[PDB]
Structures are given as C-alpha cells and as structure tokens.
C-alpha cells in the first residue's frame, strides 16, 4: 500500500558504484513529502520533474538506484556528465526523468584504517550506455601485447577501492546516492503520490 522507501534510504548496507543496485517500486502510494522536508540530504536535484509537484503525479513504475561514491563525484550523477563514475560506473541518459538524492555518510562508510569494501571502475574500452551495469573483472588491456589474466605492462585491473578515512576532506568523504527514475508508459499507473 505505502511505498517501501525506508528500505532504500535506510538500508544497512549499500553497494559499490560499479555494481549499483536497482530496486523496483511498484503498486504503492508514494509519499515524497518526507524527502522534501528532510534536511539530511546534500543533493536533491530532479530532472524533468519538480519535487514540490510530485504528490499529484502518477507513474506506471518507479526505480531506485543506490550506490556509494565520494563527494567530488556526486556532480557526475546527472545527464550530460563525464568522469570515471559517469563513463565507467553509472550513466544517466540525457532524457532522464527523476531525482538524484545524496547525503554524506562519513560516520557509517569510514573506518579509521580506511574502508576498502567499496569499489569503482577505473578502466574500460568504452563509455557506459545509459543505465548499463558492468561487473566484469577482466584485465583491461590498454596496449598492443595482450594480457593473460595477470596484470603487467599496459595490463591493469579495472576495479579500484576508495580510501574513506574519517579525516579526509568533504570532497573525499563517502556519499550515499539514491537515484529515483520514473517511467510513464501508455499503461495504468500503479505508483501514485500522496
């Protein structure tokens, strides 16, 4: 009946951006008023839709993408952006319709010795298409001679880990992202706002 937004935002564990997690929100009354008033969000940028006039807009399906990146990368979670996250981890299309929500999670995703559980993709032969997920760990061949599963000359490992130490500056501290995207088909609307 009531949309399970708690299970997305308040989840105990988030995923790495290279293996970002999608949850399907369907068949429920979507209360967006909390997010509107909530002062716990550092980024609440919506594209194609307004957050205020969201409690009178029905949608056929809503999807929630969640991952963890560092502050200096939250700006890349938007249409028309480039960078390591936008090119190799999570790409939004130019016609994206939805909201990008983010908040600082330094107290949770940082250990004093550095949290290394979160990864991100560093090398790829090509940019990601919109809403593409790459979880392969094949050795990135950057040059002439091939790689045989081992790193070496012009042979890299595609995944890298963040530092995430409590003393880091804001721009290097971990951030939790929730990307709500709305789809509207010529279909009955199961997700309505109220």
């Amino acid at each position, epitope marked *: 009946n009531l949309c399970p937004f708690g299970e997305v935002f308040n989840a105990t564990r988030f995923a790495s951006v290279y293996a970002w997690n999608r949850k399907r929100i369907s068949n429920c009354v979507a209360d967006y008023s909390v997010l509107y008033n909530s002062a716990s969000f550092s980024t609440f940028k919506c594209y194609g839709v307004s957050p205020t006039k969201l409690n009178d807009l029905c949608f056929t399906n809503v999807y929630a993408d969640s991952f963890v990146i560092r502050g200096d990368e939250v700006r890349q979670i938007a249409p028309g952006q480039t*960078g390591k996250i936008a090119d190799y981890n999570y790409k939004l299309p130019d016609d994206f319709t939805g909201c990008v929500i983010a908040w600082n999670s330094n107290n949770l995703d940082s250990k004093v010795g550095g949290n290394y559980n979160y990864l991100y993709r*560093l090398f790829r032969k090509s940019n990601l298409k919109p809403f593409e997920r790459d979880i392969s760990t094949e050795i990135y061949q950057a040059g002439s001679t091939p790689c045989n599963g081992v790193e*070496g000359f012009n042979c890299y490992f595609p995944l890298q880990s963040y530092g995430f130490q409590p003393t880091n500056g804001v721009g290097y501290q971990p951030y939790r992202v929730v990307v709500l995207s709305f789809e509207l088909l010529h279909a009955p609307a199961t997700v309505c706002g109220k």
Partner: antibody
Amino acid sequence: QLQLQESGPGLVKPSQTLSLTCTVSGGSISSGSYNWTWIRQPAGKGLEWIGRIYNSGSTNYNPSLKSRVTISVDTSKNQLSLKVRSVTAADTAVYYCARHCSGGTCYPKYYYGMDVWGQGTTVTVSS
Amino acid sequence: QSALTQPPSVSEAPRQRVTISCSGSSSNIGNNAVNWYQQFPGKAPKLLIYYDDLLPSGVSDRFSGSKSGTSASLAISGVQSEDEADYYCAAWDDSLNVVVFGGGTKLTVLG
C-alpha cells in the same frame, strides 16, 4: 626507498655529445610497469619531454629531437643513460629522470603518473 | 609544446580557494589522462594529482583535480604558505606523440 641518482658533466662543448646517467637505488630498474623517461627544463621556462624506454630496449622520442637523442639501460649497473649529440645553446636546461607507471604491477599503483624523480643535473652548453 | 595552456600566476588570500585551469585540445586532455605536478624553487616536480582526479598518499586532501572536455583544473581549497610553488599539468598528446606540459602556474599566497 625508491630513489634515482643523476650524474653528468655540468658543461658540455657545442656540437659534441652530451651524456648523463640516472642510477636507481633501493630496488631494481626492470621491475614494475614503468616507462623510464627523460625531461629537461630551461631555467625559467617549462618542462620538455625528451623520450622514454620500456620493456627491454624499445624507445620512443620527441620528434623535434628524435634524431639526436639516445636512451639506453644498463641493467647490470642498474642505471639508464641519456645521449644528446651535436648540442647547441638551446639544449641548456636542467635535466631530470623520472619513472612513468603504465600497468598493474606498479607499486604504488599511480597510473599515468611520474612517480619518482631525480634531483636534476644542470647542463650548460657553451665552449 | 605549448599545447596545454595555464595562467602564468594566480594569487589568493590565505584560507581561500584557488583554481588553476589547464586548457588543451582533444588530442591531449580530450582523450588522455591529465597529471598535475608541484615544483618548489630549486627542486624537482612532485606528483600531485594522477589520472585526472586521484590523490597520492602524503599529499594534502586540500588538493583535488577535475576534468571536463579538453580542459583540466587543479583546486587548492584553503591556501597556505606551504603551497607557494609552480604547478604543471601534463598529458600525452596523440598528435605530437609527446608528454605535454603546461607553462606552469605560480601560486603566491597573498596574506
């Protein structure tokens, strides 16, 4: 303790060959995924990339200087050398040696970055 | 050569924010990683930012790099007396077949 030690004559005579050395201490020169490059800097001006050496001898030089430069590696002496032939006053600069990482067997894994530099020897080309 | 272009000098007050821009073309910054180096008077350049925006251990997190299109920028939030040096941007140019360095930007803290 990865350190590079540069040695060479401070003064070189025009039209003759300039020769420098860059001896590696605290490790081995033929280890990681590194491009061992040479860079010179005229006093007061900017940096100029001379060339590089990788694998077991292969090299690629700056086209404006490709014919006059030679970059070798003496693994037994654990050093790389620079040869600049037929020098002019325009070759007066502070010459550095550094290591450029291009792979996954670099420690630390500073991809595309010029990791460890030499102190820099000053070459003055004049008779 | 002079493919990468930086302002010759930028100055700001202590505890302010300074941006050192690096303009190039698609053959260097557009399709290749940008490295930043810090050079103090009388010493060799020191790797400051590698692969566009990555920070080595031992460099203050006040520094950060960014890249969009054919231009890169180095940001030093919280300028300090320790930060007065020459900063060069570097990248491999596919046309020249050469590691291109900028002219360098001399940061002078004003206070």
